């Protein structure tokens, strides 16, 4: 394993995505959202995804000339038609509009209609926080989860993200998928014959397993609860947006030449429209401080506030760089667009 | 376990809350939210709590003459200062203002500032879905949970609810506590020396236990996830409203003479400002139907959609009346304000 500066990694990704077809302005936005993930230790959403993105952009499955349209439907609501643009581009754009609206009218609910994969969604809610607002976000994902007590796939790992401002540079960020584990993990254990916890995934019959090769679908986190959340996220970023929903949602490998048509929903709340933002920021910082002060149980060195472990990594990254798997580096500096295909 | 009609139950409760000091109209509201709960099988939030509400109303711990004040802060935002009025009354008022705002302006975020316990929170989101809107609600609660990896309590079981309109009278209702299980359940097994799943609670050291008498605090659902979820709910319905938050949140049995000062946040979204409401409703009904037709796993006679089990119970209750514990029933028909004190 190697470590590289944020800037070099940003450029490598940006150049790669340009070379595959995106306008540079687009490639650079995608890149920034990926570098963000890696600096926070979220490698699953980092530079490892560049090769698959390039293959898709290259084949027209991500729109390189999107026809954006921001349809404002009311004082605090709006839909950003993204014409299947890269999810990072679409979602950042949508959130910017939301921030604008909430800044003026206290609140904003903005839909992102027909986009590709937008990345670690904590990046978008952090936009809001850096602007001093509470930010909430969620989106649909590839079908991969059985409902509670079920044996067929229906919903995706539909993530939900949240972020709120503290004092100074302090931001509280919480991100979470609705399944116990992420499918990628099942594939890794697939790599190394390695076995897996009986809570991660279920088989074709819906029975849990320790055999990653026997896995057919993931399980919802905390059973009925995760299941209800993913359904909720599907209702808020899909059905509400008239987009495909549930098992109709496109999957990554369906058709690299076709837009994903995914939906995303942002909610922004301006604390000034509810009470002192100054006391809001002071109390969020106080929350951070207290939780972190709590006596840890055996097996723990400390108690971290939600997302703190990622904040620490992000800070270190801005100084020592970002860790990147050597193969990815070699892929980035090579001339290939994609070696292994997702066809 | 007698069986009585909602009408009878609702009247009994109403009278008893009146006798304690509440105005008929507020008691009527409290009673209907409580009957709602029992009808859904949510006994923990039903008539079992009348005795404790009577005693707090009697000692002034619940403002009997609340001076309500609805501060409209913007086009789609508002705060209902409740003056430590009864939670069912306050949350319903707020939701009403939310429903009206979203009707005109597509979206509404309303906070309920300083109220007592508002019962089964799914009741309020159902208000929104009966009106054809999407409803989301969440509120703070009595500190009972250790943070992920922690050994002292901080947050409460902070619940979350959501509901959306299907075709015709159909409604999809989802609600959830952020802990694996409710404190009540620890009490059940405790009041009957029954070991419990080591996922529910932890000992005084922060180490999960199987012995209910060893339970010192509850565990957050799915570990870090419910941990982030309770924090989010706390920031949204507490810190956002300038109310005590986290460990500051008042406990039920602390001071029967003091206002609880709880907060609650409602978010309503008018499907019309985002796409075809009739298509929305039609898709929600499709979601319900298809989840029901999913091949169930070995050990499930069938797959239910979120909250369906409670939907079933509610329907039946309106026909077969509600079951009520003898202890609770004889208390409601007697003239006593309460037979025991909740400290």
- The two three-digit tokens of residue B58, written as one number: 């009697």
CB-based burial label for B34 (10 Å; 0-12, 13-18, 19+) = buried
Distance from CA of B85 to the nearest CA of A (A): 20
Please, which experimental method was used? X-ray
The resolution, in angstroms to one decimal, equals: 2.2
A31 to A13, A89, B1: CA distances (angstroms): 6, 10, 63
Residues 6+ apart with CB under 8 A from B214: B203, B204
Give the residue among B196, B172, B174, B173 at the shortest CA–CA distance from B184: B196
Determine contact, residues B240/A287, Cβ cutoff 8 Å: no
Q: What CA–CA distance (Å, rounded) separates A192 from A212?
A: 10
Determine contact, residues B185/A277, Cβ cutoff 8 Å: no
Determine contact, residues A330/A9, Cβ cutoff 8 Å: no
Determine contact, residues B219/B197, Cβ cutoff 8 Å: no
Question: A163 in contact with B at a CB cutoff of 8 Å?
Answer: no
Contacts of residue B310 in chain A, CB cutoff 8 Å? none
Q: Mutate which of A180, A294, A311 to disrupt the B interface (most B C-beta within 10 Å)? A: A294
H/E run at residue A185 = helix A183-191
> What sign has the CA pseudo-torsion A220, A223, A225, A227?
positive
Give the residue among B284, B244, B291 at the shortest CA–CA distance from B162: B284
Task: Give catalytic status of residue A117 as yes or no.
Answer: yes
- The two three-digit tokens of residue A70, written as one number: 């921001």
Determine contact, residues B141/B274, Cβ cutoff 8 Å: no
Distance from CA of A41 to the nearest CA of B (A): 16
- The two three-digit tokens of residue B330, written as one number: 């004889």
Three-state DSSP class for B179? strand
- The two three-digit tokens of residue A143, written as one number: 């079908």
Q: What CA–CA distance (Å, rounded) separates A21 from A59?
A: 9
Determine contact, residues A189/A182, Cβ cutoff 8 Å: no
Three-state DSSP class for A309? helix
Could you tell me which chain A residue has the CA closest to the CA of B265?
Answer: A274
Q: What CA–CA distance (Å, rounded) separates A240 from A249?
A: 14
Contacts of residue B283 in chain A, CB cutoff 8 Å? 239, 245
Query: What is the pairing mode between strands A217-218 and A160-165?
Result: unpaired
Instruction: Check A26, A43, A45, A117 and give the catalytic one.
Output: A117
Determine contact, residues A238/A140, Cβ cutoff 8 Å: yes
Give the residue among B81, B64, B60 at the shortest CA–CA distance from B26: B64
Q: What CA–CA distance (Å, rounded) separates B148 from A143?
A: 29
Contacts of residue B162 in chain A, CB cutoff 8 Å? 228, 232, 235
Q: Which CATH architecture has domain A1-67+307-343?
A: Orthogonal Bundle (1.10)
Determine contact, residues A125/A108, Cβ cutoff 8 Å: no
Where do the structural domains in chain A lie, given as residue ranges? 1-67+307-343, 68-306
The domain A68-306 is placed in CATH, from the list 3.20.20.330, 3.30.1370.60, 3.40.50.720, 3.40.50.300, at 3.30.1370.60
A331 to A19, A50, A59, A184, A212: CA distances (angstroms): 13, 9, 19, 20, 27
A326 is in an annotated binding site: no
Q: What CA–CA distance (Å, rounded) separates A29 from A34?
A: 9
- The two three-digit tokens of residue B45, written as one number: 């939030």
Contacts across the A-B interface (CB distance below 8 Å)? 248
Q: What CA–CA distance (Å, rounded) separates B160 from B162?
A: 7
Give the residue among A163, A205, A158, A208 at the shortest CA–CA distance from A182: A158
Angle between helices B6-20 and B50-58 (to 10 degrees): 20
- Nearest residue, CB atoms, B296 vs list A149, A273, A299: A149
Q: What CA–CA distance (Å, rounded) separates B294 from A93?
A: 37
Distance from CA of B162 to the nearest CA of A (A): 7
Angle between helices A277-293 and B224-237 (to 10 degrees): 150
Question: A98 in contact with B at a CB cutoff of 8 Å?
Answer: no
- Which chain A residues in 21-60 lie under 8 Å from chain B, judged by CB atoms? none
Q: What CA–CA distance (Å, rounded) separates B176 from B178?
A: 6
Dihedral (C-alpha) B121, B125, B127, B133: value to the nearest 10 degrees?
A: 170
DSSP bridge pairs for B72: B78
Give the residue among A183, A203, A166, A205 at the shortest CA–CA distance from A289: A166
């Amino acid at each position: 394993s190697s470590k590289i500066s944020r800037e070099t990694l940003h450029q490598l990704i940006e150049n790669k995505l340009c070379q595959a077809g995106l306008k540079r302005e687009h490639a650079a936005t995608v890149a920034e959202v990926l570098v963000y993930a890696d600096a926070r230790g979220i490698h699953s959403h980092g530079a490892v995804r560049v090769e698959y993105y390039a293959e898709r952009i290259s084949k027209g499955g991500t729109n390189r000339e999107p026809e954006f349209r921001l349809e404002e439907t009311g004082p605090c609501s709006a839909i950003l038609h993204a014409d299947n643009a890269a999810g990072q581009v679409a979602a950042k754009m949508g959130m910017e509009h939301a921030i604008k609206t909430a800044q003026q009218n206290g609140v904003a609910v903005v839909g992102i209609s027909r986009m590709g994969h937008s990345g670690a969604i904590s990046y978008f809610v952090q936009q809001a926080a850096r602007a001093g607002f509470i930010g909430i976000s969620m989106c649909q994902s590839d079908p991969m989860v059985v409902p509670f007590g079920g044996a067929e796939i229906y919903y995706g790992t539909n993530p939900l993200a949240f972020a709120a401002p503290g004092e100074g540079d302090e931001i509280l960020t919480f991100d979470m998928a609705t399944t116990v584990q992420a499918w990628g993990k099942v594939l890794d254990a697939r790599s190394r014959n390695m076995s897996i916890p009986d809570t991660w995934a279920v088989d074709k019959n819906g029975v849990p397993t320790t055999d990653p090769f026997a896995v057919h679908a993931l399980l919802p986190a905390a059973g009925p609860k995760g299941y209800g959340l993913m359904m909720m996220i599907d209702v808020l970023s899909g059905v509400l947006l008239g987009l495909p929903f549930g098992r109709q949602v496109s999957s990554m490998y369906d058709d690299l030449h076709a837009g994903r048509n995914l939906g995303q929903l942002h909610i922004v709340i301006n604390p000034n429209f509810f009470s002192s933002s100054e006391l809001f920021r002071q109390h969020l910082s106080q929350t951070m401080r207290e939780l972190n002060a709590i006596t840890p149980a055996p097996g723990f060195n400390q108690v971290y506030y939600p997302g703190q472990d990622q904040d620490i990594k992000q800070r270190k990254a801005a100084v020592e760089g970002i860790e990147i798997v050597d193969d990815i580096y070699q892929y980035l500096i090579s001339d290939a667009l994609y070696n292994t295909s997702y066809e």
